[PDB]
Amino acid sequence: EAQVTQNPRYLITVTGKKLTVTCSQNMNHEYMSWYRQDPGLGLRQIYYSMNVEVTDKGDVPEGYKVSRKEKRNFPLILESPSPNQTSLYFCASSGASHEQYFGPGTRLTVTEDLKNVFPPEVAVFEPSEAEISHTQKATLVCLATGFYPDHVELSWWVNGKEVHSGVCTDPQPLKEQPALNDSRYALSSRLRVSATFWQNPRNHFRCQVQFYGLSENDEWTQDRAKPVTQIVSAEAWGRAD
């Protein structure tokens, strides 16, 4: 299970406030590098180090700074963060041969104001009486809306346990306001089961969504509740025919 560790996993910040994403590696790999991936632009290298105290700028290094004082760590510093530095970051390391192993990645969003941060609204929709009569299968529809940024993890839980068979979560969030830079997002997942199963009123269906927002540290002035990292859910119970 030995891997590249990036901390933290998710992050929100105001333009300006500097930050640093660490990357740990316990494979004694002399090669370490950082990549940012953007839609339509793919994976881009920022800086790379072939060994300790060895550093070389990648294709897009502007605004980024690194240090290789030790072999295990290869942190990435952003002195004066910009909204266009909002992206999916990855840390890779190579040793034997030249095969690289990627950290699970870090999602960073640079906003001009933390007032733009919104948690998700989860609501689940009961299957169509029509769907059962015609298919004899039941499909539930989870709906997560109005959250900013695009940092979430959805999952279905049935009777207290996680579900996977019969679920299809959209691969990527949807920009509610495509034309807006600060648009809020939305995502849906489906759960289809036997019409038999759903008609059982003893069956408990819960949709859970992980929200990666602000930390108990950041300031909050607004009246609405502090959009902190939290978990929101929506349920539904079996309905007799």
Partner 1 sequence: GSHSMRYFSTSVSRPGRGEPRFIAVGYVDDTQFVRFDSDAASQRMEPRAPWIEQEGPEYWDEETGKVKAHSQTDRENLRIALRYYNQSEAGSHTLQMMFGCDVGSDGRFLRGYHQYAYDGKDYIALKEDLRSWTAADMAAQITKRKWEAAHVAEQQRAYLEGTCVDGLRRYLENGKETLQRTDPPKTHMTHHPISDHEATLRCWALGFYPAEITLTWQRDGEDQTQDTELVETRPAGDGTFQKWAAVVVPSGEEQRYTCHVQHEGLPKPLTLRW
Partner 2 sequence: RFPLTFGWCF
Partner 3 sequence: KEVEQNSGPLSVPEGAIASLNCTYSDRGSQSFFWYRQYSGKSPELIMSIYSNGDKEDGRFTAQLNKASQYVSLLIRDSQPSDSATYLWGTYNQGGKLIFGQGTELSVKPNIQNPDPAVYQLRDSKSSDKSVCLFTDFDSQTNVSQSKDSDVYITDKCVLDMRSMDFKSNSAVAWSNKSDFACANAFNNSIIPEDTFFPS
Residues found near partner 3 in the complex (CB under 8 A) = 33, 42-45, 48, 50, 56, 58-59, 90, 92, 97-105, 123-131, 133-135, 137, 139, 141, 143, 165-172, 174, 176, 186, 188, 190, 192-194, 234, 236
165 binds partner 1 (CB under 8 A): no
> Per CB under 8 A, which region of 95-103, 131-139, 189-197, 230-238 contacts partner 2?
95-103
Q: b/e for 124-136, b at 16 or more Cβ within 10 A?
A: beebeeeebeeee
Please report how close the Cβ of residue 233 comes to partner 1 at its closest, in angstroms.
47
Q: Name, in order, each residue with C-beta under 8 angstroms of 207's C-beta and a sequence gap of 6 or more.
A: 122, 124, 140, 142, 154, 155, 156, 157, 189, 191, 233, 234, 235
Instruction: Measure the CA–CA gap between 187 and 144, rounded to whole angstroms.
Output: 5
58 binds, among partner 1, partner 3, partner 2, none (CB under 5 to 8 A by kind): partner 3
- Where does this chain touch partner 2 (CB under 8 A) — which range of 28-36, 107-115, 146-154, 185-193? 28-36
For partner 1, how many residues bind (rule: CB under 8 A)?
A: 17
Q: Which is nearer to partner 3, 11 or 92 (CB)?
A: 92
141 interacts with, out of partner 2, partner 1, partner 3, none, CB within 5 to 8 A per kind: partner 3
Q: How far apart are CA 119 and CA 138, in angstroms?
A: 29
Question: What is the nearest approach in angstroms of partner 1 to the Cβ of residue 4?
Answer: 18
CB 74 within 8 Å of CB 87: no
Q: In the stretch 20-59, what mask flags binding to partner 1 with x, by CB under 8 A?
A: --------x-xx----------------xxxxxxxxxx--
2 binds partner 1 (CB under 8 A): no
Of 98 and 164, the one with the shorter C-beta distance to partner 2 is 98
The residues, any chain, with a CB within 8 Å of residue 163's CB and separated by 6 or more, are 155, 156, 157, 191
Pairing label, strands 19-25, 65-66: unpaired
For residue 214, give the amino acid letter.
L
Asked whether 25 and 15 are in contact (CB, 8 A), the reply is: no
Among 3, 5, 9, 30, binds partner 2 (CB under 8 A): 30
What token pair was written down for 137?
A: 């299968």
Instruction: Provide the token pair at 169.
Output: 């979560």
97 binds partner 2 (CB under 8 A): yes
Spatial separation of the C-alpha atoms in residues 65 and 49, rounded to whole Å: 12
Report the interface residues with partner 1, using CB under 8 A: 28, 30-31, 48-57, 71, 96-98
Report the interface residues with partner 2, using CB under 8 A: 28-31, 50-51, 94-98
